[PDB]
């Protein structure tokens, strides 16, 4: 069982973890420390409109006529850094940069959104989500209470995050999982699926071994984690449905400027 192959898979896992730590300053460990009240360096809780206004000093403004579209434009602009970090991470995946460059772009242009949601789950618990770079905490029920269609923006991400966070993955697990997401041979428009699957097969072996070594308590964790890719994709494609809801909405879609800024840090 501990043979040259398994050692190579552990080396791959370590390589990915190291690149992950280098590429992603916001780790799950850091997020969970905040969420479980361990960093004494502590987020202000925004749980209603009153606390929202009282948090005005802590929401820094960074920056369409539709508020929702402006939010999406802002968050997608703010996501560039994440996209660049994920792309940088992908370069560390053995074989990735040797793929047809079109396929690299295709893999990343689908994968980055799923990875952003995966990492967003690290910032979430059942109560809410860290915002303002770990400096604020926006409650899930406050977000859910906002007038349509805003109240529906984040709840499916929370529903996912609760189910995903129940897997108790750590950054070592996530480093490989994210690589498996990127090396998805099923993306539309892929030119050469087989070299992608060759890499993903290696990453999957590495992930399977990682999860066996790291989660003795979890039956079928590998399968359960792979099934979460279904939920991730669903969340991404739900954004298309949200856009249609927004264009059809004729009710008031005003939103407090601080909520707009908060949503722009979300995805």
């Amino acid at each position: 069982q501990l043979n040259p192959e398994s050692a190579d898979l552990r080396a791959l896992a370590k390589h990915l973890y190291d690149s992950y730590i280098k590429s992603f300053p916001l780790t799950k460990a850091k997020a969970r420390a905040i969420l479980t009240g361990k960093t004494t360096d502590s987020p202000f809780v925004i749980y209603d409109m009153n606390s929202l206004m009282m948090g005005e000093d802590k929401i820094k403004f960074k920056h369409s006529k539709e508020v929702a579209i402006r939010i999406f434009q802002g968050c997608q602009f703010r996501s560039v850094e994440a996209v660049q970090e994920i792309t940088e991470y992908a370069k560390s995946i053995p074989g990735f940069v040797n793929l047809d460059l079109n396929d690299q772009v295709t893999l990343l242009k689908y994968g980055v959104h799923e990875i952003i949601y995966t990492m967003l789950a690290s910032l979430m618990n059942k109560d809410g989500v860290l915002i303002s770079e770990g400096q604020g905490f926006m409650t899930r029920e406050f977000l859910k209470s906002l007038r349509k269609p805003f109240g529906d923006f984040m709840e499916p991400k929370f529903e996912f995050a609760v189910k995903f966070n129940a897997l108790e993955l750590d950054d070592s697990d996530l480093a490989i999982f994210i690589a498996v997401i990127i090396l998805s041979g099923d993306r539309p428009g892929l030119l050469n699926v087989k070299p992608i699957e060759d890499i993903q097969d290696n990453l999957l072996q590495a992930l399977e071994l990682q999860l066996k070594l790291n989660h003795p308590e979890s039956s079928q964790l590998f399968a359960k984690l792979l099934q979460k890719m279904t939920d991730l994709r669903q969340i991404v494609t739900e954004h298309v449905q949200l856009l249609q809801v927004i264009k059809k909405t004729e009710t008031d879609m005003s939103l407090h400027p601080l909520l707009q800024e908060i949503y722009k840090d979300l995805y």
Partner: peptide, 11 residues
Amino acid sequence: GLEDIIRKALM
């Protein structure tokens, strides 16, 4: 915009 951002980041 995204494909260009990724293409650039891959450089």
